[PDB]
Amino acid sequence: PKESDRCGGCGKFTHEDKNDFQWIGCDSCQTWYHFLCSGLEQFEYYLYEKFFCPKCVPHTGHSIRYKVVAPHRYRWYSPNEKHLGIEVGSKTWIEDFITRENTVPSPTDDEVCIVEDGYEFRREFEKLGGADNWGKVFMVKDMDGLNMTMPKPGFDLEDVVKIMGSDYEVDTIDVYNQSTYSMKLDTFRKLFRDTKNRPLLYNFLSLEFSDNNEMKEIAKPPRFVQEISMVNRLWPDVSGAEYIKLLQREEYLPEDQRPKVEQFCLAGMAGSYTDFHVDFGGSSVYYHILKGEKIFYIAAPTEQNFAAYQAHETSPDTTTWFGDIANGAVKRVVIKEGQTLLIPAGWIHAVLTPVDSLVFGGNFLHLGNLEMQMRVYHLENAIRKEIRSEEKFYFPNFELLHWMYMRNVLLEKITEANQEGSDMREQEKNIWTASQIMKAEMERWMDRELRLGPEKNAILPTDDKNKIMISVRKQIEIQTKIQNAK
Amino acid sequence: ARTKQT
Numbered sequence: 001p002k003e004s005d006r007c008g009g010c011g012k013f014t015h016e017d018k019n020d021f022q023w024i025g026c027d028s029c030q031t032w033y034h035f036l037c038s039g040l041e042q043f044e045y046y047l048y049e050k051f052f053c054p055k056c057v058p059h060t061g062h063s064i065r066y067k068v069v070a071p072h073r074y075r076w077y078s079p080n081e082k083h084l085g086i087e088v089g090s091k092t093w094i095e096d097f098i099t100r101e102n103t104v105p106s107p108t109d110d111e112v113c114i115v116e117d118g119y120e121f122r123r124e125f126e127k128l129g130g131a132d133n134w135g136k137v138f139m140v141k142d143m144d145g146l147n148m149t150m151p152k153p154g155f156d157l158e159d160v161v162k163i164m165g166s167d168y169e170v171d172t173i174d175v176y177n178q179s180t181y182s183m184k185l186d187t188f189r190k191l192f193r194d195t196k197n198r199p200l201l202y203n204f205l206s207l208e209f210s211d212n213n214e215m216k217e218i219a220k221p222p223r224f225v226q227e228i229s230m231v232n233r234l235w236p237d238v239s240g241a242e243y244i245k246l247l248q249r250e251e252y253l254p255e256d257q258r259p260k261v262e263q264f265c266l267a268g269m270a271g272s273y274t275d276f277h278v279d280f281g282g283s284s285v286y287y288h289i290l291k292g293e294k295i296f297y298i299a300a301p302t303e304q305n306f307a308a309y310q311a312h313e314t315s316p317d318t319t320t321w322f323g324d325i326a327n328g329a330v331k332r333v334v335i336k337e338g339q340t341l342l343i344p345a346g347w348i349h350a351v352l353t354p355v356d357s358l359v360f361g362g363n364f365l366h367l368g369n370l371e372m373q374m375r376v377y378h379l380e381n382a383i384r385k386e387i388r389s390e391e392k393f394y395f396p397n398f399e400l401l402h403w404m405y406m407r408n409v410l411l412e413k414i415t416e417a418n419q420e421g422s423d424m425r426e427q428e429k430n431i432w433t434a435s436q437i438m439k440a441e442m443e444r445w446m447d448r449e450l451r452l453g454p455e456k457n458a459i460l461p462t463d464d465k466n467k468i469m470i471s472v473r474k475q476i477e478i479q480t481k482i483q484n485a486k
Numbered sequence: 487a488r489t490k491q492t
């Protein structure tokens with residue numbers, strides 16, 4: 001081939017390969033570099049008008065970044081978008097938004113319930129039917145009572161990067177561009193320390209640390225969350241005889257299959273803004289502000305609001321804030337240092353970060369919200385039919401998780417029930433109704449799979465599924481025959 | 487910035 005076309009380097013024509021297959025040219029020496037060999041991290045790929053490779057920087061100066069020409073646009077650098085409208089949430093949009101931000105209505109007592117501590121939460125949570133009837137959002141002022149393991153105050157980003165590693169790569173939002181890129185934790189810290197100079201804002205929401213032996217012990221979900229978590233139910237963190245018995249039955253599940261979404265760490269700069277959405281899979285959320293402050297803008301999961309949200313999301317429009325077209329559905333709820341927010345399935349929400357913040361939270365699925373979860377799933381699929389998105393923004397192995405839950409959990413219980421008496425409505429009415437609901441949804445999945453084959457990759461052979469569905473139908477019909485008898 | 491993909 002040709003020498004000029006050789007990184008870089010790396011000194012090779014083809015990278016070992018995520019580099020993808022992308023290079024960048026040096027506006028000095030003119031030699032090409034594979035992106036992964038340029039010295040740039042993903043978040044810089046679009047920042048520089050003139051890129052100067054490491055070989056040339058001490059004698060050519062740093063790289064020159066585009067002039068901020070359209071601060072009201074995601075492409076704030078493209079002079080062509082100067083005349084175009086203000087986009088939510090460009091720098092221009094967020095600034096303005098902050099000034100009127102507090103005019104948005106507070107919630108009704110039916111919507112959010114504020115409690116002083118976890119003990120009061122427990123009592124109010126129980127009054128409303130508990131987790132199986134959980135439909136409203138809770139804000140807890142003081143964690144005492146929640147059994148939620150958290151770092152002692154004074155703990156901060158500095159401790160996070162030390163434990164996780166300075167080279168650890170986290171997915172970060174470029175707020176003003178409203179996109180996400182990779183950034184070394186170290187690189188985030190440096191920018192986060194520089195409070196007085198911040199051309200662009202950064203805020204990472206996706207830092208899952210359930211696989212870090214040190215971290216996963218410093219910040220855990222509340223006990224009640226752990227108890228109802230479906231992911232937890234399937235991939236128990238047990239040991240010895242327990243784990244062995246868990247193996248003897250084919251109830252073992254690969255760690256690389258587990259959805260890692262229950263232990264997130266979030267850090268964000270003041271002026272950060274994450275736009276409206278529903279957490280993937282219609283998952284519920286715990287959310288604890290260790291430092292800083294967060295303002296959530298929430299709307300109940302009603303059919304009217306879903307219709308509005310679905311339109312909002314599929315609409316190519318970019319200038320219209322969801323709140324303005326939601327008919328007073330959006331409410332304002334502030335969370336401050338030390339406080340905790342508990343959101344059940346379906347809630348549409350946006351969030352403003354008025355102040356540099358460090359948060360620990362997590363997403364989970366639970367039987368109590370099975371319908372709403374499936375409703376949200378439908379919502380995601382409906383939206384996907386129009387726009388094209390990545391898969392790392394939706395609930396990982398959502399369908400597999402249910403196949404496993406049905407087979408490993410619900411099915412075994414209906415069976416044991418069936419083997420004695422035994423009316424499940426007597427001491428397991430909640431399990432039974434979840435089974436019928438999950439089965440209904442799975443039947444559709446099966447049908448769909450037979451009407452156009454499986455998907456791509458893996459994992460559960462159509463054969464296996466069908467075998468499972470045959471088993472579930474049998475036990476379910478048996479149980480219904482028992483009930484009809486009584 | 488001048489880039490490329492192969």
Ligand SMILES: O=C(O)CNC(=O)C(=O)O
Pocket residue numbers: 205266268273274279285287294349351352361
């Ligand atoms: O704090 C961020 O800006 C957004 N976080 C959430 O919406 C939460 O995980 O439900």
Ligand SMILES: [Fe+2]
Pocket residue numbers: 277278279349
């Ligand atoms: Fe969210």
Ligand SMILES: [Zn+2]
Pocket residue numbers: 026028029030031052053054055056
């Ligand atoms: Zn050079």
Ligand SMILES: [Zn+2]
Pocket residue numbers: 007008009010011012015033034035036037
């Ligand atoms: Zn290279």
